[PDB]
Design a protein around this ligand. Structure first.
Ligand code: CL
Length: 144
């Protein structure tokens, strides 16, 4: 019914309720998958035709997602550099994925959290995240 949206060329954001079918991904030229679903072990291996990455996030309130920004950005960038689609996805919702996406836009395009988020809303105006990551994104903004 619904598919991952291309935020920037080669950068895809998938909502939990999106069709993560392998054929659909091959068709979009997506070869890299960044899974930000919580409570999973750290992994980075090749899975079929894809380079699968899974970061060790915890859904506990004390968990800091921002610390994974550098490695997430490096992964997304390495994919886009090689002209390969990269997918940021979470089975738990849209919040962690859009947060990693916004962080990437902030650093890559040299934008503030608000500007980067507005860019995301241009391509996916329906998006409705929670506010659990405002503080981390605002804090990450200072880093730039
Ligand atoms: Cl999430």
């Amino acid at each position: 019914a619904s598919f991952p949206v291309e935020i920037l060329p080669f950068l895809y954001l998938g909502c939990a309720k999106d069709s993560t079918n392998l054929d659909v991904l091959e068709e979009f030229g997506i070869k890299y998958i960044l899974n930000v679903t919580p409570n999973l072990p750290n992994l980075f291996e090749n899975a079929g035709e894809f380079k699968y990455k899974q970061i060790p996030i915890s859904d506990h309130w004390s968990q800091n997602l921002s610390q994974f920004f550098p490695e997430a950005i490096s992964f997304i960038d390495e994919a886009r550099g090689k002209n390969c689609g990269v997918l940021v996805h979470s089975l738990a919702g849209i919040s962690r994925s859009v947060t990693v996406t916004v962080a990437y836009l902030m650093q890559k395009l040299n934008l503030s959290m608000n500007d980067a988020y507005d860019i995301v809303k241009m391509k996916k105006s329906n998006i409705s995240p929670n506010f659990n990551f405002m503080g981390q994104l605002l804090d990450f903004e200072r880093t730039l």
